[PDB]
Amino acid sequence: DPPPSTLLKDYQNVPGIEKVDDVVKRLLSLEMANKKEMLKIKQEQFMKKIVANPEDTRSLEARIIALSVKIRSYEEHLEKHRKDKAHKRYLLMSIDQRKKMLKNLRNTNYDVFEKICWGLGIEYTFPP
Amino acid sequence: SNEDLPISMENPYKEPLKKCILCGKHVDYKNVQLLSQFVSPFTGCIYGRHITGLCGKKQKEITKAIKRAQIMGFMPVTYKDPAYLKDPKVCNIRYR
Amino acid sequence: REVLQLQEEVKNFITRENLEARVEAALDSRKNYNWAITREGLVVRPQR
Amino acid sequence: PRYELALILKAMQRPETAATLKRTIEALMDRGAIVRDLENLGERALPYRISAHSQQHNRGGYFLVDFYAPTAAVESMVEHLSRDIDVIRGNIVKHPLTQELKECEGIVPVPLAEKLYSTKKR
Amino acid sequence: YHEDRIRAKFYSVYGSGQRAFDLFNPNFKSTCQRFVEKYTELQKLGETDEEKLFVETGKALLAEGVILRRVG
Amino acid sequence: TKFSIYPPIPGEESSLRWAGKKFEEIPIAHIKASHNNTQIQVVSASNEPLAFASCGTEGFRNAKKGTGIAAQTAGIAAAARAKQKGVIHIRVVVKGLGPGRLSAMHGLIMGGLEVISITDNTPIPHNGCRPRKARKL
Amino acid sequence: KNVLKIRRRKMNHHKYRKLVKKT
Amino acid sequence: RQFSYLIENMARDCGEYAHTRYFRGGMLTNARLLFGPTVRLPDLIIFLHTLNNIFEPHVAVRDAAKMNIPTVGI
Amino acid sequence: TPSLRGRLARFGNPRKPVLKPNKPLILANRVGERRREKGEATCITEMSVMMACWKQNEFRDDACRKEIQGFLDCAARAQEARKMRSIQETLGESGSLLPNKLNKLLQRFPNKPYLS
Amino acid sequence: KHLKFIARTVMVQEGNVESAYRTLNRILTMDGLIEDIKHRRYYEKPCRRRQRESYERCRRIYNMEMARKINFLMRKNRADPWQGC
RNA sequence: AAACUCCAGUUGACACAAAAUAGACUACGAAAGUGGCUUUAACAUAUCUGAACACACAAUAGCUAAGACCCAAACUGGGAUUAGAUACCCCACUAUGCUUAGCCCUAAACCUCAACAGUUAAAUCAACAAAACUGCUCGCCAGAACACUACGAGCCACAGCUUAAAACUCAAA
RNA sequence: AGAGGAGACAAGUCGUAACAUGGUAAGUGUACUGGAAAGUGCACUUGGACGAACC
Ligand code: FES
Ligand SMILES: [Mg+2]
Ligand SMILES: [Mg+2]
Ligand SMILES: [Mg+2]
Ligand SMILES: [Mg+2]
Ligand SMILES: [Mg+2]
Numbered sequence A: 001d002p003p004p005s006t007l008l009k010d011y012q013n014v015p016g017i018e019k020v021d022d023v024v025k026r027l028l029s030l031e032m033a034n035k036k037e038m039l040k041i042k043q044e045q046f047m048k049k050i051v052a053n054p055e056d057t058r059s060l061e062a063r064i065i066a067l068s069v070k071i072r073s074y075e076e077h078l079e080k081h082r083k084d085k086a087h088k089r090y091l092l093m094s095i096d097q098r099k100k101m102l103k104n105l106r107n108t109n110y111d112v113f114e115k116i117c118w119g120l121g122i123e124y125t126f127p128p
Numbered sequence B: 001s002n003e004d005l006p007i008s009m010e011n012p013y014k015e016p017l018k019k020c021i022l023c024g025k026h027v028d029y030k031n032v033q034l035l036s037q038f039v040s041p042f043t044g045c046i047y048g049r050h051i052t053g054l055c056g057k058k059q060k061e062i063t064k065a066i067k068r069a070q071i072m073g074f075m076p077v078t079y080k081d082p083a084y085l086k087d088p089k090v091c092n093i094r095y096r
Numbered sequence C: 001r002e003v004l005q006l007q008e009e010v011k012n013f014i015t016r017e018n019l020e021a022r023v024e025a026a027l028d029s030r031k032n033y034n035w036a037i038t039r040e041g042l043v044v045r046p047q048r
Numbered sequence D: 001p002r003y004e005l006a007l008i009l010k011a012m013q014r015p016e017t018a019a020t021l022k023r024t025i026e027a028l029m030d031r032g033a034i035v036r037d038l039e040n041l042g043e044r045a046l047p048y049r050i051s052a053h054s055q056q057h058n059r060g061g062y063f064l065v066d067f068y069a070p071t072a073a074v075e076s077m078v079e080h081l082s083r084d085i086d087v088i089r090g091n092i093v094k095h096p097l098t099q100e101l102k103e104c105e106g107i108v109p110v111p112l113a114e115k116l117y118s119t120k121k122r
Numbered sequence E: 001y002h003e004d005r006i007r008a009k010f011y012s013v014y015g016s017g018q019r020a021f022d023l024f025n026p027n028f029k030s031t032c033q034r035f036v037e038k039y040t041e042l043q044k045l046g047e048t049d050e051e052k053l054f055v056e057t058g059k060a061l062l063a064e065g066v067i068l069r070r071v072g
Numbered sequence F: 001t002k003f004s005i006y007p008p009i010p011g012e013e014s015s016l017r018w019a020g021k022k023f024e025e026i027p028i029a030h031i032k033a034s035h036n037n038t039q040i041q042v043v044s045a046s047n048e049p050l051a052f053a054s055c056g057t058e059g060f061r062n063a064k065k066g067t068g069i070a071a072q073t074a075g076i077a078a079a080a081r082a083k084q085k086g087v088i089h090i091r092v093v094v095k096g097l098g099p100g101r102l103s104a105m106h107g108l109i110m111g112g113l114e115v116i117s118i119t120d121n122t123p124i125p126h127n128g129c130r131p132r133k134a135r136k137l
Numbered sequence G: 001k002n003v004l005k006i007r008r009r010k011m012n013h014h015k016y017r018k019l020v021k022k023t
Numbered sequence H: 001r002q003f004s005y006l007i008e009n010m011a012r013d014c015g016e017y018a019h020t021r022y023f024r025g026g027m028l029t030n031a032r033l034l035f036g037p038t039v040r041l042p043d044l045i046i047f048l049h050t051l052n053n054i055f056e057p058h059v060a061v062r063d064a065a066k067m068n069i070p071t072v073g074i
Numbered sequence I: 001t002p003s004l005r006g007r008l009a010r011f012g013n014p015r016k017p018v019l020k021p022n023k024p025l026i027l028a029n030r031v032g033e034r035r036r037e038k039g040e041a042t043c044i045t046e047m048s049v050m051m052a053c054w055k056q057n058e059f060r061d062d063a064c065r066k067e068i069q070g071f072l073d074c075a076a077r078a079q080e081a082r083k084m085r086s087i088q089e090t091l092g093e094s095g096s097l098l099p100n101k102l103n104k105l106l107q108r109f110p111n112k113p114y115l116s
Numbered sequence J: 001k002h003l004k005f006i007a008r009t010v011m012v013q014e015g016n017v018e019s020a021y022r023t024l025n026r027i028l029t030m031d032g033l034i035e036d037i038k039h040r041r042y043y044e045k046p047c048r049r050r051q052r053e054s055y056e057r058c059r060r061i062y063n064m065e066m067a068r069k070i071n072f073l074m075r076k077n078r079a080d081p082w083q084g085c
Numbered sequence K: 001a002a003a004c005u006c007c008a009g010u011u012g013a014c015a016c017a018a019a020a021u022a023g024a025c026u027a028c029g030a031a032a033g034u035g036g037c038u039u040u041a042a043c044a045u046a047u048c049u050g051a052a053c054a055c056a057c058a059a060u061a062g063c064u065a066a067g068a069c070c071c072a073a074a075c076u077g078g079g080a081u082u083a084g085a086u087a088c089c090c091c092a093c094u095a096u097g098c099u100u101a102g103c104c105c106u107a108a109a110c111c112u113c114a115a116c117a118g119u120u121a122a123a124u125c126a127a128c129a130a131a132a133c134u135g136c137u138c139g140c141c142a143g144a145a146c147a148c149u150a151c152g153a154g155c156c157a158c159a160g161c162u163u164a165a166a167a168c169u170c171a172a173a
Numbered sequence L: 001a002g003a004g005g006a007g008a009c010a011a012g013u014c015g016u017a018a019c020a021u022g023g024u025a026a027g028u029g030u031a032c033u034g035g036a037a038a039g040u041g042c043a044c045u046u047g048g049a050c051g052a053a054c055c
């Protein structure tokens, strides 16, 4: 997970944010924000790590990365709420959707597909 | 062509849409004086939108604020607070 | 602009230094969230 | 996130109320919260009798603590307020000023529904 | 019609003219119609600002002796 | 001044009086009007019982208890006992929608007690306990 | 509609359950 | 009924015929029975009000269409 | 008036139905009859006063004359008031209009749930 | 736990107990308390409650529309202006 | 009538139960379902259809094990009614409804109206119902009854659930 | 081969469960119970009604 001191995605690109009070840095940190801000930071990190164009969100790679972040959040949620059938269904359906997206990406762009699999740690397995 | 023919345009005589009395104003559970305006003086029942006249959004906001105030110790449940009996009557209901 | 406003606000926050002074000031002061509404949509403040 | 703790304290003299408020704000800070303001709503008769810690309260002092706390501190603060004896009733909400009010153009009238039944003669 | 916006603004500002519509006379010119005619005349004179044109129309009608009592 | 249907509030200065007594001091007549019975208990403002009368205590039995006539007789008896104990004005608090909900009140008026206020205290749960199953008739 | 088919199925199921209980 | 009298007067003045009362069933499709075997039906029917008093088309419109009588109508 | 949009189960309505009427929500061209109010036993209080006085006076009419007269007057008033209530129902002043005249008015302007 | 002699209380005016009780009953009826008590005497199963609510909502819609039509047409109850034609 | 009179009425203390009014709102969810309050996490898919060969859910009822138990309540017992009353009516109480951990996997699970895209043009249209349709795809249906049955198979289910026939019979349903 | 089931044959017997608000609305799932149709509990359905201005 990103360190709690990490600033929010919106506030990390404002000038002079390093000259503000430590209290202000705490307020704009992931510590003082919900888990979805952490998910957005994770998504941004993964995009910068993997995709050729970090600013492109409609690409299949961006969709795969966002779905992977959602899947990780669902798994973390289910680890605590093991009797949440709705989120269990969301996790399974998201897994299937990511498998479909990976199949499409592998058929279209193989090198980028390998980069996705390596960066996100996805072991693409052919269905039986 | 012909100058006197009609022209397509928006309705200029269209009156502005009627606004609920609470439109644009923040409803807060601590504002027991405002919430008491929408409860029955005798039974504490929350009045329906046909009585209050509020829109759906403001009716839901008033309802949730009243429930929050009642459960958090700001507002009585079974009756309207007597301190607010003489507040402006904004509910379309008469008992007498 | 929001960051600047937050930096301005932080000065007035309650810390472990001015805790007792702020507590005494709060006890001395009163805050009223009560205001009624009229059929014409006008806010009526309490007579305080 | 930004939370507002609405606090109803037992009606006490000024030193006891000050000590209780200081204890509560110190607990909030210890759990990680940044307290921004403490607003006194005054002492008033409760809308209804409250039985807290084997004591029936008819009057209470109302305070608000606006603060910014991590999501994990809310549960701990709720437990702490439950354990406290000087607190008649404490509830932490999400700060109402956080939720911005979307502009409303006005009440859009609802026309009478049409074509619900076939126009065949009956 | 183009004049409909002028008529709506006139009704919103000065209200309905105390002069009564006589829908039996085909050549009846209501106070609103006189306002519209003066406004069109002034607009043809090169003026383009809507608020300034409305103000000049009101002032010209007042100077001619027309009673124009604003609703507020 | 103008008459107000709202009762005076304790802790507020009110000029209204009844035999020199404030609204907080007037005795209370509790009328439980069940579907088959009507019980009337007069108590002091300090919660001291003074009189009690039910349709059963008036010699009415079985279905005859749950009638307006029996409730009126019970009201007359309770009012007579309360007037013997020195009660003149009463605050009426009625709970239940039985046949004797109103007639019992009339009995009190026939007994010689003046009703200054009427209150409904019918127990209406906010979806608490579950009542018995519906009858098939 | 009437419930004649439902009644036939109801009687069949009731008799089957009773047969199962008996044996 | 606001113009029954005017229309009847106009029909009498122009020499033609008028019907401004309750149109009985069959005045056109059953004329040979109501009037006689030698009755002469109108060769043109003019509706100054095509709607009856319950805001439905006048039955005479359909009946004259059946009897092949051209109908002028406002 | 409550909204009907999206209430009934119809094609194109995605949500489950809100209302399940057993009759079509179409205005009829007639109103319900002037429903009578079920009569209640009257003069019960005066009867009770008279009977209690009888019990106290051993059913001696001479002592109870006043209460007996009151009960009789109440009974006569109740009978005359029932007759006057029948007369008023024939008059129809209490209601905005009698059901017959209202049915005539609705006949003049019938509902049109069909095309023509 | 609430204060007493505030909720559902009506002051009697000059001993007019009849009118005070009528006002109290009207208040309870308008607030719906009387119907709530009557329905809470015996348990109403959720399917039955939903059916009753649907029926009452349809009845309210129909009654309001019929009242609107009656009020709209009541002006036409005046005398016949074209009598004899 | 039986039953309770350690009962009833007021006042005070008082919950692992259920969530008036709002709601004349029509929202969330894939469906089942979800209408007390607060907080946390959270409501898949930047074409659509698609699994009965799988995976995950699935009201109420029910089983298993440990708890709670106000109230309700199958069964049972008593009272009444009745020709009888193994019911309707009244009273008492249990399984059960609740919590936790597993099962069971069924509903008039129906809005008996499949998903997606589109039309109101006409040749609109058996009847009723909730107007008639078009393109595409999947699932299902082929006289009634036998039959939510038998056998086979699968299942934590063992008086069960899913899939599911045939023979004899009729000219209907 | 003792038996069970279905259908036909159609009797007699015991009730009247369904069709009208069928006299306790009917039905689905499920559990228990009963000479028998069936009864009751729990949830669901309208393939019931609630009379359709106010009263
Ligand atoms: S009228 Fe503006 S929000 Fe309701
Ligand atoms: Mg069979
Ligand atoms: Mg699909
Ligand atoms: Mg299940
Ligand atoms: Mg139990
Ligand atoms: Mg019990």
Ligand SMILES: [Mg+2]
Pocket: none
């Ligand atoms: Mg029983």
Ligand SMILES: [Mg+2]
Pocket: K098
């Ligand atoms: Mg619970």
Ligand SMILES: [Mg+2]
Pocket: K109, L044
């Ligand atoms: Mg369902």
Ligand SMILES: [Mg+2]
Pocket: K148
């Ligand atoms: Mg089955």
Ligand SMILES: [Mg+2]
Pocket: none
């Ligand atoms: Mg089977």
Ligand SMILES: [Mg+2]
Pocket: none
């Ligand atoms: Mg087998």
Ligand SMILES: [Mg+2]
Pocket: L022
């Ligand atoms: Mg029968």
Ligand SMILES: [Mg+2]
Pocket: L024
């Ligand atoms: Mg029956």
Ligand SMILES: [Mg+2]
Pocket: none
């Ligand atoms: Mg049943």
Ligand SMILES: [Mg+2]
Pocket: L033, L039, L040
């Ligand atoms: Mg039984």
